[PDB]
Amino acid sequence: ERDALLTDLVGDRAAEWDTSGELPRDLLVRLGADGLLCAEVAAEHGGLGLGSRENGEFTAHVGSLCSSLRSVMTSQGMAAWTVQRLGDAGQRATFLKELTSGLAAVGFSERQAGSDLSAMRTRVRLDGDTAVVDGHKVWTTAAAYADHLVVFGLQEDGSGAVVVVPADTPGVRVERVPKPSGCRAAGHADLHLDQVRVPAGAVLAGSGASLPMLVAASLAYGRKSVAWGCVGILRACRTAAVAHARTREQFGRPLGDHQLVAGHIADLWTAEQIAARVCEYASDHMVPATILAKHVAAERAAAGAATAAQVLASAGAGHVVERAYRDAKLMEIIEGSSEMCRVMLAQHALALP
Numbered sequence: 462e463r464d465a466l467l468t469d470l471v472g473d474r475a476a477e478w479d480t481s482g483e484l485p486r487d488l489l490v491r492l493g494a495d496g497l498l499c500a501e502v503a504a505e506h507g508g509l510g511l512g513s514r515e516n517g518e519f520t521a522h523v524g525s526l527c528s529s530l531r532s533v534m535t536s537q538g539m540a541a542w543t544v545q546r547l548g549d550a551g552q553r554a555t556f557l558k559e560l561t562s563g564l565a566a567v568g569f570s571e572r573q574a575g576s577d578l579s580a581m582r583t584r585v586r587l588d589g590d591t592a593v594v595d596g597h598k599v600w601t602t603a604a605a606y607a608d609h610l611v612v613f614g615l616q617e618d619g620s621g622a623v624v625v626v627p628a629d630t631p632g633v634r635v636e637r638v639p640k641p642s643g644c645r646a647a648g649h650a651d652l653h654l655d656q657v658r659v660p661a662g663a664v665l666a667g668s669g670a671s672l673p674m675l676v677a678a679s680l681a682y683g684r685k686s687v688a689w690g691c692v693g694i695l696r697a698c699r700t701a702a703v704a705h706a707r708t709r710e711q712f713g714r715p716l717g718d719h720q721l722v723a724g725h726i727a728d729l730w731t732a733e734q735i736a737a738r739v740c741e742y743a744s745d746h747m748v749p750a751t752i753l754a755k756h757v758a759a760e761r762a763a764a765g766a767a768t769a770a771q772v773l774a775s776a777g778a779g780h781v782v783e784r785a786y787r788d789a790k791l792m793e794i795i796e797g798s799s800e801m802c803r804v805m806l807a808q809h810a811l812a813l814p
């Protein structure tokens with residue numbers, strides 16, 4: 462059991478969560494403690510130890526129900542991955558167990574550093590037994606719910622470091638984004654870090670490599686998660702469109718019998734299949750396949766959502782299709798925008814024999 466559980470946990474409440482702009486805190490801790498939202502974490506740390514396909518299809522299913530909830534899973538998973546990819550033995554042992562005993566967020570983006578991550582100015586300064594982080598992050602997903610804030614920044618010598626900061630450490634202020642356009646219940650919030658003091662142990666080991674590499678390591682997850690999340694959006698759109706198409710009648714027959722509508726259904730099904738295949742391929746493998754999966758799944762999900770909205774018409778004008786339309790648009794922008802994905806994939810192709 463896993464998807465069935467989420468179908469009923471969600472069980473017809475996504476619309477209200479979306480319009481109210483918030484997810485139940487109790488649900489997230491419950492899922493976190495169950496190891497879900499963190500499924501790929503090794504069993505040694507109390508994780509479920511799921512592979513990329515298993516966790517991926519699970520992420521896709523949650524995405525098909527509520528993308529705000531799905532976004533929390535991506536943030537959770539990304540934080541966990543970042544710590545187990547950079548942290549040491551003691552660091553991974555401490556943080557990973559907490560992320561699977563019931564919340565974290567990952568903030569690297571800044572007002573002046575969006576697509577250009579190397580433009581962030583937040584600084585982390587090791588000073589004896591203590592680290593001092595000072596900066597500001599924007600649009601941090603799930604930050605309004607997090608206990609831990611995984612913050613990226615520049616050291617001093619070897620620029621680029623990552624620090625796990627307790628949400629309640631004096632000097633930190635998490636200001637929720639007022640009116641987010643999509644994934645409205647994901648708890649987006651800007652982070653204000655005014656001279657925050659934390660143990661030197663909070664700074665993950667390997668926090669000495671360049672700005673890229675790090676971030677690139679964390680973005681690998683997230684891009685994979687967002688890609689599967691988009692497969693979920695396509696699932697919800699395809700199923701809602703087909704349901705409307707074989708039940709709604711106009712001009713004396715089910716909409717599905719009108720070839721133009723059939724065409725939309727075919728394109729929705731095809732989009733869903735394409736996104737799944739690319740996600741599966743990336744999950745098997747690596748960096749380019751993941752960028753590719755996120756890119757295609759996102760663009761196809763955005764197109765699919767518009768197509769599904771067309772099919773449902775006034776009935777979809779709340780709604781899974783309504784939310785998919787707004788949510789998918791955002792997916793084309795985050796975790797490496799469509800434009801950045803094109804520049805990166807272009808660079809990849811231009812380096813092939």
Ligand SMILES: Cc1cc2nc3c(=O)[nH]c(=O)nc-3n(C[C@H](O)[C@H](O)[C@H](O)COP(=O)(O)OP(=O)(O)OC[C@H]3O[C@@H](n4cnc5c(N)ncnc54)[C@H](O)[C@@H]3O)c2cc1C
Pocket residue numbers: 536567568569570571574575576577599600601602603643644649791794795796798799800801804
């Ligand atoms: C719902 C949501 C959740 C988010 N969650 C997080 C999170 O958890 N953590 C986090 O750190 N950030 C998060 N972000 C922000 C996400 O990282 C951003 O979408 C991205 O960095 C947005 O940058 P924006 O900076 O100003 O702009 P840019 O100002 O980056 O936007 C630029 C526009 O110009 C294009 N562009 C920029 N440079 C180039 C170029 N060289 N070539 C071609 N086109 C270019 C872009 O593709 C884009 O369309 C989230 C955002 C949203 C909307």
